[model samples]
Target chain A: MKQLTILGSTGSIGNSTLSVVRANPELFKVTALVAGRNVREMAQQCLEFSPRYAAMSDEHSAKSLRLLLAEQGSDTEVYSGETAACELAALDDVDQVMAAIVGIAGLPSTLAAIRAGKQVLLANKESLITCGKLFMDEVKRSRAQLLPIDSEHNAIFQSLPERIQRQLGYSSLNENGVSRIILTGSGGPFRETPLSQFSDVTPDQACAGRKISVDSATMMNKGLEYIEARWLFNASAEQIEVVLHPQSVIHSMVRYHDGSILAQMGTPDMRTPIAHAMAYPMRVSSGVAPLDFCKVGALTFTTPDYQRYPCLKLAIDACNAGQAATTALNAANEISVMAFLDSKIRFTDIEVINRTVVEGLLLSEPTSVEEVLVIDRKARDVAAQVIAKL
Target chain B: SNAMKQLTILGSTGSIGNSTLSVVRANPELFKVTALVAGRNVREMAQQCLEFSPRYAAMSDEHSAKSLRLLLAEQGSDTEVYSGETAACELAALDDVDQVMAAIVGIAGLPSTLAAIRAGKQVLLANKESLITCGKLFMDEVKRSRAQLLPIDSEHNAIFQSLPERIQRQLGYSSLNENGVSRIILTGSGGPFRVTPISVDSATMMNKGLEYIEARWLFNASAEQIEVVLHPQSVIHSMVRYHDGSILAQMGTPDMRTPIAHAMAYPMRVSSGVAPLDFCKVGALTFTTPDYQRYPCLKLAIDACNAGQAATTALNAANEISVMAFLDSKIRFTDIEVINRTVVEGLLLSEPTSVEEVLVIDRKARDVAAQVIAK
Candidate 1:
């Protein structure tokens, strides 16, 4: 059985990863379960999985988990803090690391896992967004295998040739006859909403995960994914396209030079991508239902409107500018999305704040992770200032 | 630098042959026309000889061969002309030819197709009759001779595109699970009778059923593993479902050049000169399972597929006569399936091992079908 370290085991993606592990118990063994502060969930997971190590981001939560494990008569080791999480990621016994931690907090541990030369099932967006160049460079240096767990990237990864998939860091897209990478999006709830009614959209109407819902509404998620795809696939701005497919059945597609488009289509499910990455070059049952074409009825595709999704346009512009600009845009978007979520700024102001911050940041090719983080912090501060003015 | 692949077109006057020529015309540096074979379309064959300037040209009929030779001499074309079935087979097995485009219509093309395969020339099969009439024998010859068989039909080409390179290289027969292929959904346009009263194989989806049998032999899949999906648009050529719930589909505009260009450049992609399918213009793509009640001919083909080689060959031969009778107004379109079923049920011979046995059974089935139609 392949040994696994599941970072952020309490999150939604983490829960899905564990579910896959639970289904394929014969193929996988849980070596470690790392979470932020959900002690109860961590205690339950530690008991159920019987992992060798249980790590927490908080010291007090780690102490509580230690007590809970002792009281439950379990012998799983307990550790605390980011360094310990990184240590768990680098453990020699672990065969793969499921980097499911959210936001920038997941970055260091994910980098550590890559540095350890482990096959990383990457769900973390920040590792590619905040410091994509540095992260990819480190991946090449370590010769680590990185598989995308995000549905779109996973779909594109699946659609690509086996040779390109195996040697992604060294392969050339043009040489492989790959003309374009088509990233599909659902266009969110605001897709059909009138331009004048944008200020009236509520977080409830936007759906689950208020921040993500707003990101979906603005199509900033696709923008961030576009940046992520550039680093992940080594693609250019012209080589990538964002097709607004509201049905969400066709996850993504890759167009070849022969006028053939190979698409990876399925029902919207994370477990499928998870299982796909977990079993590379081999297929395992994911338990996800196949798409019913009759019920799915019709799938539609359209070009995204710049007037409708200005954040997407801004993100693309930032992506074309430089790595530092994309990093700043990513940080600025997170702050603006938070401001919109807190009701401090209108939904449309998100674009203004993001564009201002992205343009205001001094562009430079960041050669280190520390510079990337510094740029991210500065952009967030600039976005907060722009929001204050509005 | 590697030499350009020399091609012998078996039916230069036909539609598929014209498409293959179009691909060659587009990529002149990649391929050379070594031979041209046709039956009785002297005017078109002579024009093709003048245009492609092949070293050899053959016609099954001597009259047509003489007319082509006279026309080519008038056009100052030095293409050597030959006559009859033996000449066609000789052209197909030409030593200098690297690939053969088997586009001759009906059973007349089968001998030349087998000749190319046995000669170890890479056969780009556009002839459905080759597989429908003698799939077992033909596939065995292909395997023994080590001839590379590439599919040229839209459906089979799409299926080939969706498959992995490993599975694709093992053309005649391959394991499904070993290659991660779960199902091969062969899609059909369902023809003009989809919503109307028009009937028979094209309308009754007998064409799709025939394709189902062809798919079974080509991919070495069990009957259950191949399915028929009625997609009227014919945009998504076909799809292959994997064990991981991922379906890889190949879709493009309904142009013959695409599949021809794809096969001509197997490992690499060249421009097909066909317009890319504009998704904005392409309306909703729909899929549904074929109803046995509506498509009796399709059901007969499937049943014949399970019944083995003899039954399938009988069904193919019977269907050709039945379809011909319907078009000739000797039998109603509705009576096409009746004739086919009667002929197939009447001539259930033991599986034929040799090409001679296959041709004998095929002729027997045709006579039976003609007699049934007459009655």
Candidate 2:
């Protein structure tokens, strides 16, 4: 059995990973479950999964988890703080790490798993968005198997032939006979939102978490994923194309040199990808419902409008500029989206704050993770200042 | 370029034969035409011989073979001409030929196809009669002779492309891990009978039925393992469903060269001269369950698939005669299914252990189908 440590054990991806574990009990074992201070759910997961270690990000939550484990007469070790979570990620017994922690918080444990030479099922986007070069550099130095857990990346990975999928970390696209990587997105809830009514779309109407809702409305999630896909597949900016597929059935596609486009289609579910990564080079039932084409009705594709989604254009520009530019752009977007969510700025101001901060930053190439982290904080502060002026 | 595979084109004047030559013409570095065999089309055969300059040419018709010899002699070509079925079969098993393109039509193509397989040559099978007439015997001989048999039919080739290489190497007869494959879905255009009235256009549905039987032996799948989906566009040739809710579909323009080129360049992909399938231009792909009521011949084929080798062979023979009767206006188009049902139902054989027995049953079924059409 492949022993696993789930880095964000209480989130949607983590829950799906556990569900896959429940489906194939003989294939996977949970060695550790780490979450950010949700002790009630963590305690229940520990009691049911019977993990050897349970780590929480905060000390108060960890103390409560310790009491709950003791009351339940379980002998699981409890760990607190981000350092402890990072340490657990590098544990010798952990064979695979599910790096599902959202935002920049997921970066440390993900890097730690790479340092430990574990197979990292990466779901976190910031790992590639902020520190893509450094993350890939560490991955190469450590030779850790980085399997993509995001639906689009996983779909692109599956569309590839077996030989290319085996050495995906640095597989040259041209040498492997791939022409282009197409990243498909649903375009979010506001895909057809009239340009005249852009300011009227409420946060709840945007249809997801506050930051993600804003990102989806602006189509920046696709842009961030474009950056991630470039680094993940070692593709040039010209080789990757993003299309708006509102149905979300066809996760992604790869165009070949022979004019054949091999697409991976399925129901939009996290468990399928989790099960896929959990059993690489083999297939397992992910309990997700099969796609019924007759019922699927019509599926369509179209090009993205750069004029409407300036954040996307900015991200692409930053991607071409350098590592510090992408890092600064990513951090700036996060602050700008937060400002929009707090109503301190209008929805249209999100692009203004992000573009102003990203284009305003001037820095040298970051050679270390510390340099990337420094740029991230500085960009956030600059974005906050721009938001304050607006 | 000098390491090209020597090929014997079995039906050099038919549509499939012409398509094979098109592929060879495009990829001269990969293939060399060593022999061209035709039935009676001496004019087309002589033209091919002059262009390809094959070492040998055979015609099943003696008179046509004589005229081809004269035409080649006039052209100052050194292409040797041979006559009759024996020469065609002999040319198929030639020691120098590395691959045989068995594209001849109907039962007339069977013996030469069998000869190519027995000689341990890589056989690119386009003839449906070889499988529909004697599936078990043909597959058994393929195993014993160690001949590499690749399907040239569009649906079978698509199914082959969609399947994993390991499963494909076994020719779909292996114990495929349940977690790996769910089923093989064969797509058909549902034919012209899909709309309007079938009283005049039943032959299209009968052809689909024959493809259904052909798929059974080609993939070694049971009747339950194969499903027929009616796709009117005929763009997505076929698909293989996986256990993880993923379907690998091979789609392209409706051109024969694509599958032929795909098989010619196995394990690699080459340009087929056919335009790629543009999804943006392709408005919508629609699918539905096959209605057995509308296509009774398809239902008959599925039933015959479950009835063993003799029944499938009998059904194929019966359909051929019935469809010919409909085309000649000797019987109503709707009466074709009647002839098919009568011939198969009257045939008493449950299993034919040998190919000769299957051939005998096939002839008997054809006679019965003709008698039914007369009534």
Q: Against the true structure, what is each candidate's TM-score?
A: 0.92, 0.88
**Chain B TM, every candidate:** 0.95, 0.94
Worst 10 residues of 2 chain A by lDDT: A201-210
Fold similarity of candidate 1's chain A to the true chain A, as a TM-score: 0.95
The residue-by-residue lDDT of candidate 2 on B111-189, one tens digit each, is 8999998998888899988988888888888878878788988888878767766676667356445437777889978
Q: List candidate 2 segments past 4 Å from native.
A: A58-64, A71-75, A80-95, A115-117, A137-144, A199-204, A286-288, A307-317, A343-353, A356-361, B1-9, B25-100, B115-123, B142-149, B177-179, B193-204
Candidate 2 collision pairs: none
Candidates 1 onward: DockQ, in order: 0.58, 0.39
**lDDT tens digits, residues B7-60, model 1?**
999988889999999988988888899999998888888878888889999988
- Ten-residue region with minimum lDDT total, candidate 1 chain B: B193-202
Interface CA RMSD, all predictions: 1.6, 2.4
Top candidate on TM-score is: 1
